[PDB]
């Protein structure tokens, strides 16, 4: 058995506990921003929190789901010890959604712009 | 009295015994002030040649910023204080390494 390794664009549950089921009351999922190679080597990844509680704040990025919608909180990027904390895959964000999250971070930090 | 609001490029002490660690602030004052949060990378004196280390040269003690370990931090509620400011070329470098981890 090999542990799941988070890949760029993946929507993951962090701190997964098999006792609150598919809902995970009290948790946020997260969009993975960093590449597989980095994630695999370090046991860490860069990711942004998600929530269904949209407020329409400037750094929100709408995640359009089949199931329902939510937002990535793009300003709140964090380095996460996925391997140590136990991550599971919930889904994958669309290419456009990932692009938009990165664009907003780029604005906030000022990287290429 | 107004609490110190971190600003882009500042080197701060933060709760990241309470115990603090130095961090470079990567988000602009306007954002930091409005949200009570800021983006920052942790610093260490212990260099190891590691790929995402950026050298920070002071006038006393030296170390590196660990550029890959970006963290959104509630400065407002954790008592960030200002210790200094990184040089522009140092901040630019930290941003280059992050840009690598993110398209």
UniProtKB/Swiss-Prot annotation, chain A:
Keywords, in A-Z order: ADP-ribosylation, Antiviral defense, DNA-binding, Endonuclease, Hydrolase, Nuclease, Quorum sensing, Repressor, RNA-binding, Stress response, Toxin-antitoxin system, Transcription, Transcription regulation, Translation regulation
Region (Loop 1, participates in catalytic activity): 16-27
Function: Toxic component of a type II toxin-antitoxin (TA) system. A sequence-specific endoribonuclease it inhibits protein synthesis by cleaving mRNA and inducing bacterial stasis. It is stable, single-strand specific with mRNA cleavage independent of the ribosome, although translation enhances cleavage for some mRNAs. Cleavage occurs at the 5'-end of ACA sequences, yielding a 2',3'-cyclic phosphate and a free 5'-OH, although cleavage can also occur on the 3'-end of the first A.
Annotated InterPro entries: PemK-like (IPR003477), Plasmid_toxin/cell-grow_inhib (IPR011067)
Residues where ADP-ribosylarginine is found: 3
Recorded phenotype for the gene knockout or disruption: Decreased sensitivity to dramatic intracellular increases of ppGpp. Cells missing mazE-mazF survive high temperature, various DNA-damaging agents and H(2)O(2) exposure better than wild-type cells. Cells missing mazE-mazF produce more P1 phage than wild-type cells, while introduction of lysogens into a growing non-lysogenic disruption culture is lethal. Cells missing mazE-mazF show reduced biofilm formation, and survive antibiotic treatment in log phase better than wild-type cells. However lag phase cells disrupted only for mazF had a lower survival rate than wild-type cells.
SUPFAM superfamilies assigned: Cell growth inhibitor/plasmid maintenance toxic component
Classification via Pfam families: PemK_toxin
Keyword hit for Repressor: yes
Regulation: (Microbial infection) RNA cleavage activity is reduced when ADP-ribosylated.
Induction: Expressed in exponentially growing cells. Induction has been reported to occur after amino acid starvation in a ppGpp-independent fashion and to be Lon protease-dependent, but also to not occur after amino acid starvation and to be regulated by ppGpp. Also induced in M9 minimal medium and by chloramphenicol treatment. MazE alone and in combination with MazF, represses transcription of the mazE-mazF operon. Fis activates transcription. Part of the relA-mazE-mazF-mazG operon, there is also a second mazE-mazF specific promoter which is negatively autoregulated.
Name of the protein in question: Endoribonuclease toxin MazF
Taxonomic lineage from the root: Bacteria, Pseudomonadati, Pseudomonadota, Gammaproteobacteria, Enterobacterales
GO MF term set: DNA binding; molecular function activator activity; protein homodimerization activity; protein-containing complex binding; RNA binding; RNA endonuclease activity
Residues covered by region (Loop 2, involved in substrate recognition): 52-60
GO BP: defense response to virus; mRNA catabolic process; negative regulation of cell growth; positive regulation of programmed cell death; quorum sensing; regulation of DNA-templated transcription; regulation of growth; regulation of translation
PTM: (Microbial infection) ADP-ribosylated by enterobacteria phage T4.
Source species: Escherichia coli (strain K12)
Practical uses of the protein: Can be used to produce large quantities of a single protein if the gene coding for the protein does not contain any ACA codons. Up to 90% of expressed bacterial cellular protein can be the target, which can be produced for up to 4 days. The system also works in eukaryotic cells.
Gene behind this protein: mazF
Record remark on domains: Loop 1 (residues 17-28) effects catalytic activity while recognition of the ACA cleavage site is influenced by loop 2 (residues 53-61). Alterations of loop 2 generate new cleavage sites in addition to retaining the original cleavage site.
């Amino acid at each position: 058995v090999s542990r799941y390794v988070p890949d760029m664009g993946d929507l993951i549950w962090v701190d997964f506990d098999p006792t609150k089921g598919s809902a995970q009351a009290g948790h946020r999922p997260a969009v993975v921003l960093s590449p597989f190679m980095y994630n695999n080597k370090t046991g860490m990844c860069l990711c942004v929190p998600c929530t269904t509680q949209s407020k329409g704040y400037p750094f929100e990025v709408v995640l359009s789901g089949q199931e329902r919608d939510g937002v990535a909180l793009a300003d709140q990027v964090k380095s996460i010890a996925w391997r140590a904390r136990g991550a599971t895959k919930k889904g994958t964000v669309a290419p456009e959604e990932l692009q938009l999250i990165k664009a907003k971070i780029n604005v906030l930090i000022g990287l290429s712009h």
